[PDB]
Ligand binder design. Structure first.
Ligand code: CL
Ligand code: CL
Ligand code: CL
Lengths: 932, 273, 139
């Protein structure tokens, strides 16, 4: 069998050059592809393997030269398959793509960094190969900015990176498949060690094939569109994978680099340099399955996982903490704890007072066990019997004895011992707390409007809905300044109103350690924030959540600093916020309203103005970056994006969404996790002391014109074109995506793109390799300013080379274009769109090509991603696998929607099209990862 | 430095003695090395110091890797000093002339150290070396090429501290440690066994086990019949837990309440599923 | 028990039903599930203190200074209205918390256990209205 010779050729034709000297990516992918196809032949026959290989060879042939003949060949084969062979081929290409992603992660993890490749400016910070590590960022602050070491250390102490993990917009990959992927990565890595013996290599190859087959032989359908509890279980997998051990690894590295610049202290173990938040189970915005019980559930589950990991982790700590010399305080506490009544009988019959650290640590272990057991009982029943005094309820109870051990050990010169497992444990307690993640709530402001309208209607004051914004403000301010409650059990509650109030009741019935922020979707005016503050207090929330408005539409972004100023001017709100105010901006959402360029530039300006307001009133402004941003990309780019943020918008608290489509690339691997946490911490540290350049005024004026032209084009296409929605429902799988499910994709099932949610808007166009929501508007803007003045191109180029914000924006567009193909979208059109609607797509695709050519001119590139050949190489590798899933999805849709489209089937190939469709959706989605 | 490894021994038997690969394989099948662990003639080193010694070895090893970065080397050096001082600052005289139960606990440390993972690694290497002489089979998994016996708690010759209760104790402790390790290992085994295609016999057993009414709520709300290997293995996990808890009760009391039918008493019950 | 009595009478076994069964029924009726029904008793001055902390916390004045008719007015508007009176955000002294807790205990137990709430030193209708109000507002 010399089929292996052919796939070696096609891969080498797809990626011919070597982007370094350790570039083994083509080798890795060829190895995985050979093993997988062999497994495929063994399991489903020779004819099936030859069919799959012919399809892939044709797809790589397409992604090389883009001859539409190749697409016609792929389709010719893919329609002749009966549904069974269709499912097999789709599953096959999904898994091959996953293997390609693992090869990429190995390459990135072990690519040698080249110090002679850095240029010396901020552009270095846009790729992992040249970005500054923590110590390079330190020395850069010391050299260019004359910042003293002790200043850098103080800055680090009070800094916080808060990563918010979101549910996957499609398949949150199972925890088991995460582990199998990890095994495949490890086998792949060790196979290329320059010291492995032939028997080690044979057994490694055997384990690699073994794992690949294990992955291919598990189903990814059936059961339910996973309950939010299950989705949350899968989401927390990355703590067991890399993050739990990874946090203290990173922190210790910070300690080392601080030493390597003269700082003799360590980063205080309680300092929250890294924190994690979760939306899984808390985001209700247009999502009815997220009920109050779901929220209580995910809080309790998280507390169980936390207690569990602390329990298993603390035993090794007990083995290490065998000293006897100790502090008088610790001696007293050990004798005190020894006066009491089973969880260490395999280790020691009982812990003697001659190992006091083990005594106290054993008590902490016991309390941890009782905490897990208690939370389990509350989850599965509703009450416990476990005395809350026998558990840990707040973080200070947990930290107090551990800190006693640390101080005590330091009293006796055992500081080095204390800086071991004890230090890593303390740092885990500070990072993860009793809950691992803190839950963020999100809800439409209209739902609070419904609650308050039923409240006022019940009190015979009128309808809160009819009242003007200022009349609402008056009522809410008088009610907040008074102490008299609002309502009781005697309140006509609809289904939605009861859901809202019950949500708040659940928030009040749980520890405040479990919750982060309550976030108001579709925020427009101060009554929307005041409403939530009021409902919180009237639901008896003891320690109330900080209320964070999410300004989405364009006019809302223009109105935002005024609304935040009015809020800051009210004494009640100024006293409640205690000098901190958080505002959420959703790049994807704002782009859905007004196109991407206008949304970006409007968000930069809005952050500037909000900083002006917060400086006026002495409020520390923290910006929360939602899905779609430049800070949501994977890897290197994130660094520059953080550096690019407007000055004094971060201020020691960076809050970014870790989008589901990227979390594997950011935390799936040990090294990847370290370098992610590193670039977040270093980029935050530097931006706090080295703001990006203030834009030249001609840049701001130019961007204002471009924003105008862009939004005009975008809205004229998406909203004003009457026969757009029809095209949207044909040229795109949005309808099938909503009908299948994931969640609901429409707030109002009967409306238009306005009421369509942002995630399905981005997704629907991402599946067809078209990405309309990301680039529409750039074309007419760049075109218009180049025509208005010959020299304006030179200005745009100037910005791309010197203004970080503009560079990161244009770069993201460039990357999305690297993922795009107008011919595939044209294939979807040819199969699913009416003939009289064909020119509509045609013109749109013209806008694509022109915008592509225009973006290049701004960046000074002749090809796409000319400045980051590593990423270009990787995306080129994936596209060959994804394209097959494209043709298959298009023809599958034509087969589902039209039973009048009969095809001469081919006989089934060796040992319900909807399952195929879901496979292609998950595959294409997983391969394209983040766009906009 | 010059002794024959497993494969060099294979090649010497095949070349110099004209023994066929089949004969070597049968001889291996029916062969058994039974290693008997005896109590230490003085200090049976504590388990904590065994782990500290292991860490010191690991730091020393990684410090001389020809590919480590300056920061890794710096942090490894610090971890080595940390462990050396950690070892030196523990007392080893105080308390009791360790109860034979304690001496036995310390003796069994090496199963957790290297042996538990070490046995299947060695066996797998036997499989590889057998492939390299033409043998397509693996060494049968139930064939006892390696066995472990212990005198800790059983040798009474001129040693009155070894009472019958001491023997009962070390037997129950050993069954506990075994049940623990099987329980912890079968978790990862359950994550791996996510297939759906299965045997008619195994399908029957999976549907049958599904006919019943807690140890996997952090992983899966419940295991469905579309993951039958996870069904059978989850039941085995449950039986392991009941075995450990039962032995714990028998050790600490003298009776249980755990029905012996819900545990593993003999090896065939364990191996069958 | 009543089913048993009816049944025995059905078959002309009334004399039997008028025996231990009758004594049992009568004991169930006389003593109920508690033997006795507890009467609560508290001074009116303490309810005045609770209402004073409530009105002071609402910045409407001090219920203690109010005339008997002003008290009556406020208590009646509160009783006919549908908006509650106070919440957890309430400065409770030891005695004030004691009174409110008494009402909470009364709300958390079966009504078979209680008889009457009795106001020591009663002088004017505001004291009775006060207890009725606190009763309704402690659920
Ligand atoms: Cl659940
Ligand atoms: Cl800042
Ligand atoms: Cl014992």
């Amino acid at each position: 069998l010399e089929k292996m010779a052919s796939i070696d050729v096609h891969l080498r034709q797809l990626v011919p050059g070597k982007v370094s000297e350790d570039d083994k990516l083509v080798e890795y992918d060829a190895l995985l592809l050979d093993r997988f196809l062999d497994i495929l032949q063994d399991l489903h026959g020779e004819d099936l393997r030859e069919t799959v290989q012919e399809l892939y060879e044709h797809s790589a042939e397409y992604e090389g030269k883009h001859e539409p003949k190749k697409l016609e060949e792929l389709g010719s084969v893919l329609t002749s398959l009966d549904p069974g062979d269709s499912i097999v081929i789709a599953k096959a290409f999904s898994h091959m793509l996953n293997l390609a992603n693992l090869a990429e992660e190995v390459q990135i993890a072990y690519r040698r960094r080249i110090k002679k490749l850095k240029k010396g400016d901020f552009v270095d910070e846009s790729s992992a190969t040249t970005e500054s590590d923590l110590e390079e960022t330190f020395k850069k602050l010391v050299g260019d900015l004359n910042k003293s070491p002790e200043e850098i250390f103080d800055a680090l102490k009070n800094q916080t990176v808060d990563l918010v993990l979101t549910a996957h917009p499609t398949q949150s990959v199972r925890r088991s498949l995460l582990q199998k992927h990890g095994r495949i990565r490890d086998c792949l890595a060790q196979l290329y060690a320059k010291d492995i013996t032939p028997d080690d290599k044979q057994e490694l190859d055997e384990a690699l094939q073994r794992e690949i087959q294990a992955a291919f032989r598990t189903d990814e359908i059936k059961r339910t569109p996973p309950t939010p509890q299950d989705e949350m279980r899968a989401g927390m997998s990355y703590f067991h994978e890399t993050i739990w051990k990874g946090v203290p690894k990173f922190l210790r590295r910070v300690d080392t680099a601080l030493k390597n610049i003269g700082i003799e202290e360590r980063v205080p173990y309680n300092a929250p340099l890294i924190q994690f938040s979760s939306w899984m189970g808390g985001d209700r915005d247009g999502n009815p399955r997220v009920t109050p019980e779901v929220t209580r559930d995910v809080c309790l589950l998280a507390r169980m996982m936390a207690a569990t990991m602390y329990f298993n982790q603390i035993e090794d700590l007990m083995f290490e903490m065998s000293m006897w010399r100790c502090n008088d305080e610790l001696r007293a506490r050990a004798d005190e704890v020894h006066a009491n009544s089973k969880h260490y009988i395999e280790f020691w019959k009982s812990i003697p007072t001659t190992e006091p650290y083990r005594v106290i640590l054993g008590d902490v272990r016991d309390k941890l066990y009782h905490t897990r057991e208690r939370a389990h009982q509350l989850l599965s029943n509703g009450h416990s019997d476990v005395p809350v005094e026998a558990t840990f309820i707040n973080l200070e109870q947990f930290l107090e004895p551990l800190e006693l051990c640390y101080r005590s050990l330091c009293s006796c010169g055992d500081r080095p011992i204390a800086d071991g497992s004890l230090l890593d444990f303390l740092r885990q307690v500070s990072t993860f707390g009793l809950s691992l993640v803190r839950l963020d709530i999100r809800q439409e402001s209209d739902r609070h409007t419904d609650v308050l309208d039923a409240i006022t209607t019940h009190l015979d004051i009128g309808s809160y809905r009819e009242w003007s914004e200022e009349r609402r403000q008056e009522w809410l301010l008088s009610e907040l300044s008074g102490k008299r409650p609002l309502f009781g059990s005697d309140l006509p509650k609809t289904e939605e109103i009861a859901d809202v109030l019950d949500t708040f009741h659940v928030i009040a019935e749980l520890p405040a350690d479990s919750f982060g922020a309550y976030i108001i979707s579709m925020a427009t005016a101060p009554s929307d924030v005041l409403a939530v503050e009021l409902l919180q207090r009237e639901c008896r929330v003891k320690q109330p959540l900080r209320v964070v408005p999410l300004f989405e539409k364009l006019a809302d972004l223009e109105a935002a600093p005024a609304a935040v100023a009015r809020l800051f001017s009210v004494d009640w709100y100024k006293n409640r916020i205690n000098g901190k105010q958080e505002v959420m901006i959703g790049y994807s959402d704002s782009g859905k309203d007004a196109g991407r360029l206008s949304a970006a530039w409007q968000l930069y300006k809005a952050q500037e103005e909000l900083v002006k307001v917060a400086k006026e009133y002495g409020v520390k402004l923290t910006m929360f970056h939602g899905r779609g941003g430049t800070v949501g990309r994977g890897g290197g780019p994130t660094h520059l994006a953080i550096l690019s943020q407007p000055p004094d918008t971060i201020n020691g608290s960076l809050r970014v969404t870790v989008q589901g489509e990227v979390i594997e690339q950011s935390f799936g691997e040990e090294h990847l996790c370290f370098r992610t946490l590193q670039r977040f911490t270093a980029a935050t540290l530097e931006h706090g002391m080295r703001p990006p350049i203030s834009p030249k005024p001609e840049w701001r004026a130019l961007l204002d014109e471009m924003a105008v032209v862009a939004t005009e084009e975008y809205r004229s296409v998406v909203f004003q074109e009457p026969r757009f929605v029809e095209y949207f429902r044909l040229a795109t799988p949005e309808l099938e995506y909503g009908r299948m499910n994931i969640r609901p994709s429409k707030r109002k099932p009967s409306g238009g793109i306005e009421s369509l949610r942002a995630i399905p808007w981005i997704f629907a166009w991402t599946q067809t390799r078209f990405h309309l929501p990301v680039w529409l508007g750039f074309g007419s803007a760049i075109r218009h300013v180049i025509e208005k003045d010959v020299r304006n191109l030179h200005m745009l180029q100037d910005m791309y080379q010197h203004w970080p914000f503009f560079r990161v924006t244009i770069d993201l567009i460039e990357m999305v274009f690297a993922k795009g193909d107008p011919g595939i979208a044209a294939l979807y059109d040819k199969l699913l769109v009416s003939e009289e609607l064909w020119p509509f797509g045609e013109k749109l695709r013209a806008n694509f090509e022109e915008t592509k050519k225009l973006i290049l001119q701004t960046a000074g590139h002749k090809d796409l991603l000319e400045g980051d050949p590593y990423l270009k190489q990787r995306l080129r590798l994936r596209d060959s696998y994804i394209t097959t899933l494209n043709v298959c999805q298009a023809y599958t849709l034509k087969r589902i929607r039209d039973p009048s489209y009969h095809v001469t089937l081919r006989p089934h190939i060796s040992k319900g099209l909807e399952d195929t469709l879901i496979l292609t959706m998950k595959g294409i989605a997983a391969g394209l990862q983040n766009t906009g």
